């Protein structure tokens, strides 16, 4: 269930509960139409790429698919009305905050991702120190140097 994705819904939900001081006993101000159509419109509102052409639009949809699944899971009409009582104002605020956080979460153009990736792999390797499998720094050396001959080849059979 737990995987790394941008934007934290749980914190936004608690922030809405505290900020607008939601009380549970009052019934909501939100029509079902509003909740469902707003979730769909928000899905249209989170943007990673801006292109008009259909291949870029498909790339955007493919990139945002898993995040949209998370949104649909947490922004469910039964949950939004029952699990955490939500006035209309709080729900619109949640939509706005989700969109803003997502737009902040996009990588900035001009970032040197390759150098950062090399450093990010290198630092834990320096920490590595120490049942017959090639592991750790020797395994990493084999992997990087595309070693034709391996100390511990193996086949797992299912």
């Amino acid at each position: 269930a737990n995987w790394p994705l941008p934007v934290n819904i749980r914190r936004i939900i608690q922030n809405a509960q505290q900020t607008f001081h939601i009380d549970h006993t009052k019934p909501s101000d939100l029509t079902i139409k509003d909740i469902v159509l707003g979730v769909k419109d928000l899905q249209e509102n989170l943007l990673v790429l801006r292109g008009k052409n259909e291949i870029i639009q498909n790339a955007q949809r493919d990139a945002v698919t898993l995040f949209c699944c998370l949104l649909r899971s947490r922004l469910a009409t039964r949950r939004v009305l029952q699990e955490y009582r939500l006035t209309k104002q709080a729900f619109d605020w949640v939509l706005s905050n989700i969109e803003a956080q997502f737009l902040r979460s996009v990588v900035h153009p001009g970032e040197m991702v390759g150098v950062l990736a090399a450093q990010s792999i290198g630092e834990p390797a320096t920490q590595m120190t120490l049942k017959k499998v090639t592991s750790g720094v020797p395994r990493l050396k084999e992997i990087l140097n595309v070693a034709k001959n391996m100390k511990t080849p193996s086949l797992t059979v299912y």
Partner: protein
């Protein structure tokens, strides 16, 4: 590789480092003499001119000062040797090489530069003594230690350069690590142990302690919190005064082990609107861990609030620890006599198992498991038996160790210490290993000349029954030294191998950047990936999310 990719540079400095609890995290304790040597060029403006004049008046030898002045013609004026250090009149557009001053952008670096975190912008804090001085929380990105580690400082020389350092390289900005999608820096050492001790339910603080602690917080509201206990004596929980440091609007939920909402253990953490409801603060709550308080404060409040949060938590917790105190002694390592006798009988039972398996092997009754030598199977069985004995004795010691024992307390806070440390210090260090197996017979069919030939007993093969407290025997000492020698050899070789690995990795991926189309590309233009990370997202912003739809019964999903 040595004169173009890297080069010696001006405006650089190096010095031994020590840590200031009272120094701010982004601040760096630049010594006064180093500031007297280092110069930043400042063009004279109507806004600054007065200060600049006084600086030139103050002179190069006493700081704040300036070493040189640059005219429009460009002829340098050396304040140290000039008849005109006193009569100077600064025409507009002239340059002053001012000394490095407080709250100036600099770069702080530790020489294993495996991270963007290893070179970070810092704020100048001119200090009397000669050491470079830094906050405790900044050690982790550098991996710095105060055993004698030296660190380097580089001074920007242009406004754009200073702007780049301040706007991108600042310590608060790098608090969340793009690698590992988690914070780099957290609460360490005394602050951590003291935060655990203070957060305990039994810990209560009186009005004097509360009052000074409240003042110690720089951004304190001026409102004394209502005491947790009011009737018999006005008393405050450590959690309340700790909450005073937590910024408002911060909510944290953590459930571990038997984390009932009643939470008898005081386990787990619940924080609402900057106040802690229940729990004991420890490394998971307050460390660099994912879902840590640092992560939340950096993401909602902002980086600056989180840096100030580091400072305030350190100040309060260090004050309370200083007046409460902490220590570690031999008695912490000592365990009960009944526990000791149970440990020694456990070791003896493992020895009996080894002897019986050995005798069965001598009768050839033992059957080899498929794919392994019969001798290989014997070695595996004996090694496992002895490792289990060591672990069991250590666990017995951990049970015996009281809540007052300080090694246990460091472990609970997580500042230093592990199960293995207690096991080896009090019960049994265990069996050492060289190149994978138990110690071999360098001599003929015998590991040491004192042993008889053809002996595979744990004593002959390098299992050290005794503990560090108990005292290693001579033979045990030699075998332990063999193991430690292998450890040092492996360390020395591993550093070089990892350095080569990192250099090759960096050289391969150095050209890779995210272009404006979001395509990851190189100088040739070849697209390594069309969307960076396949989602186009910065990993520091990314956090762990639970997807409820994937799991659960279909009936529960429906309901």
């Amino acid at each position: 590789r040595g004169n173009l990719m890297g080069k010696r540079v001006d405006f650089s400095a190096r010095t031994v480092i020590s840590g200031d609890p009272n120094l701010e995290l982004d601040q760096v304790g630049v010594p006064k003499s180093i500031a007297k040597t280092l110069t930043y060029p400042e063009v004279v403006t109507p806004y600054n001119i007065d200060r600049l004049t006084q600086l030139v008046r103050n002179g190069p030898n006493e700081h704040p000062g300036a070493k040189y002045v640059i005219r429009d013609s460009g002829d340098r004026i050396d304040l140290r040797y000039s008849k005109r250090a006193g009569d100077i009149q600064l025409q507009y557009g002239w340059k002053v090489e001012r000394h490095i001053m407080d709250n100036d952008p600099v770069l702080f670096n530790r020489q294993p530069s495996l991270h963007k975190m290893s070179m970070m912008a810092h704020r100048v804090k001119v200090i009397p003594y000669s050491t470079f001085r830094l906050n405790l929380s900044v050690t982790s990105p550098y991996n710095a230690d105060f055993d004698g580690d030296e660190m380097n400082l580089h001074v920007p020389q242009s406004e754009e350069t200073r702007a780049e350092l301040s706007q991108l390289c600042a310590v608060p900005l790098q608090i969340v690590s793009p690698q590992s999608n988690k914070p780099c820096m957290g609460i360490v050492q005394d602050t951590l142990c003291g935060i655990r001790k203070l957060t305990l339910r039994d810990t209560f603080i009186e009005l004097d302690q509360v009052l000074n602690m409240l003042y110690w917080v720089p951004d304190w509201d001026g409102v004394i919190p209502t005491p947790a206990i009011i009737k018999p004596k006005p008393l405050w929980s450590g959690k309340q005064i700790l909450s005073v440091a937590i910024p408002n609007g911060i909510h944290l939920q953590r459930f571990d082990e038997g984390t009932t909402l009643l939470s008898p253990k005081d386990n787990g953490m619940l924080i609402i609107d900057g106040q802690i409801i229940f729990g004991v603060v420890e490394k998971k709550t307050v460390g660099s861990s994912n879902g840590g308080l640092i992560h939340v404060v950096t993401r909602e409040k902002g980086p600056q609030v989180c840096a100030k949060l580091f400072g305030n938590i350190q100040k309060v917790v260090n004050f309370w620890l200083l007046h409460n105190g902490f220590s570690t002694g031999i008695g912490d390592t000592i365990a009960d006599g009944p526990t000791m006798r149970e440990i020694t009988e456990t070791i003896a039972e493992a020895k009996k198992k080894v002897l019986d398996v050995t005798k069965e092997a001598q009768a050839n009754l033992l059957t080899a498991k498929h794919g392994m030598t019969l001798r290989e199977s014997f070695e595996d069985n004996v090694v496992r038996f002895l490792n289990e004995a060591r672990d069991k004795a250590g666990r017995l010691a951990e049970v015996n160790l009281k809540d007052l024992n300080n090694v246990k307390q460091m472990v609970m806070a997580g500042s230093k210490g592990s199960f293995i440390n207690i096991a080896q210090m009090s019960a049994c260090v265990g069996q050492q290993s060289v190149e994978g197996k138990r110690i071999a017979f360098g001599f003929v069919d015998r590991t040491l000349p004192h042993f008889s030939k053809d002996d595979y007993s744990p004593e002959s093969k390098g299992f050290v029954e005794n503990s560090y407290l108990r005292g290693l025997t001579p033979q045990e000492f030699f075998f332990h030294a063999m193991g430690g020698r292998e450890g040092l050899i492996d360390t020395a070789v591993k550093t070089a191998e990892t350095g080569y690995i990192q250099r090759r990795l960096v050289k391969a991926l150095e050209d890779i950047m995210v272009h404006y189309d979001n395509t990851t590309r190189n100088s040739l233009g070849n697209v390594i990936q069309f969307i960076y990370g396949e989602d186009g997202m910065d990993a520091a912003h990314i956090e762990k999310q639970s997807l409820d739809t994937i799991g659960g019964s279909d009936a529960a999903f429906e309901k």
